[PDB]
RNA sequence: UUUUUUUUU
């Protein structure tokens, strides 16, 4: 508006709720020392999985949501209990979910795996993250659950805060569930 | 046409022909109906996203065609130049002397529709890598046209050298394994872009970015290798065009000549759309191809072969053509031109032009006639029956005595098989 | 906007577990998450949660427990007609078809399974009915809102005089 | 699928 002629309206109305169903599969591993106290550190550490993103664009919101889901329900390995020298955290998930979003329009997907592996160093904590994901659209007529429903929430509190920890701005519509707004980045 | 009546009944019939082949088209018929060469592209994504998509797809080797087309459109758009003359062709006009033009000012742009594929995006791609990326892609297009490992590797090593001399520390993309970009030749917009680039950088050869033309030189004379042969024969013989077209002596290359020489279809205009008829889509089957003019091609290249020509031992040998009749005419013409040298006065000082003093002669025997004219050669050939002279065959054999390289189903092979005997 | 939506409701609740429950707080914690993975009608989602509250108020034992203490088990069943004031806006049309859910609950000390069979559908009748908020047996104290929040249901106890349903973010 | 010098900045 500060200039003239810089688009008008955008009649196509990208700003509107759109639903997207898809199968998801996830597997995550985290390695470090000085074993891992509290959940805020989980978000802080995993937030550096895409420092230099080289993945298939258009899937960034889905990948971020998926990393959040995987970080939510990660189960520590017995070695953490037995030895504290080199703990390890593992996670694995798979299912079919449908997400509402208003980012835009997603092109056709594909059933290809994607691997990411990066080191991290956040203050006292240092180590490695290694994820492997596979998302692909589903054209069936099943009644899948909402992706948010897959979060139990009996650990950690508030979804706006947590969605911001990962770089994700969402909304809290009174009569429904959380809908995406944009990626803060 | 001619009438053929059934004798026993006197009935009237009209024998038609089968059509296993396909019909013929001329460029003039495209500009006689519609006057705009369409070109469809996508412009939704910015330049950096397309750069990332192209670079990463090529590194992995799963790049999409539409993204490459859009990248070439978004890269070759700030290049321009001056303009000397009045460019025009087939009732079209482009600019006027004393202005500036781009590379896509030759074809009309529009909006491609339909869903589009995805890519693998990158967030670190310096701008400096645009100098050579279109060059790399055009070189890939060029090298992906010949199915031969030796030639392919020689051409790709030339391409790597071309990229190196500009942006050394450049590294090869599209690794040596799974082969890509060989299906792109089946697409229509990529070849239109390549042809437009080739024409533009062919007219303005002094441009600083002319090195792109390394990748588009195969696109100019495509599917038109019957005119090239005619010109090469005209140059080797050294005579004018009238004497060359006179020396045919069979109505099979003449049919092709009549098919190739029509009022429209302006030839000899370097700044025209003629050579790029194929890529631009102006014609499906070009009338100057070698699959619809086999007799002309074979006769021309055999005449060239029998006159100590270089580009004669690597031509192909099309089949379904009667070699006995074209071969005899080609041999006769070759002997006629290579057995009598025309000497005479060319420039005369004032009223002192030398006149040939030849009215008394003794050439009533079988010996050859002096000068070069079909009228006096057909007479000598008829008077000496159709049998080639032993001297003619000796000349033919000594003309093809030594030949090092030969390839199966080549005119050189045929000559060494029948004439070297 | 205070919208009064009428419906007939039927509810059947069952809980199975070891370590038989002692305090109502543990039972409420176990039942609050009966919908870990909801695949029912979206537009009826909040209403079902309200009905779960009712089931909590109607926790009962059975002769099975008196027959053996090593298979703790609680039953409950309710049904009738009611209408609810709500400020969720407008609810879609509702059908009369049964719905069922069964989930495992794991809170550490208490572990087992929870089963809920609900059927909520429109009340096309024009006769008056009591308040759905004035239908439970929790005359108890003013901590109805605390119980709802512990479930995760936001209600208002202001001068309106009722416990009207308020909002979502029931997840915490 | 076209093509038909293992010619070509």
Residue numbers in the entry:
A (entry chain B): 43 to 227
B (entry chain A): 2 to 422
C (entry chain C): 58 to 229
From the article:
Vesicular stomatitis virus (VSV) is a negative-strand RNA virus with a non-segmented genome, closely related to rabies virus. The VSV RNP complex assembles, together with M, into a helical, bullet-shaped structure, as it buds through the plasma membrane of an infected cell. The asymmetric unit of the VSV helical nucleocapsid, which repeats every 9 RNA nucleotides, contains one nucleoprotein (N) subunit and two (chemically identical) matrix protein subunits (M1 and M2). N is an elongated, two-lobed protein of ~420 amino-acid residues; the single stranded RNA binds in a cleft between the two lobes, with nine nucleotides per N subunit.
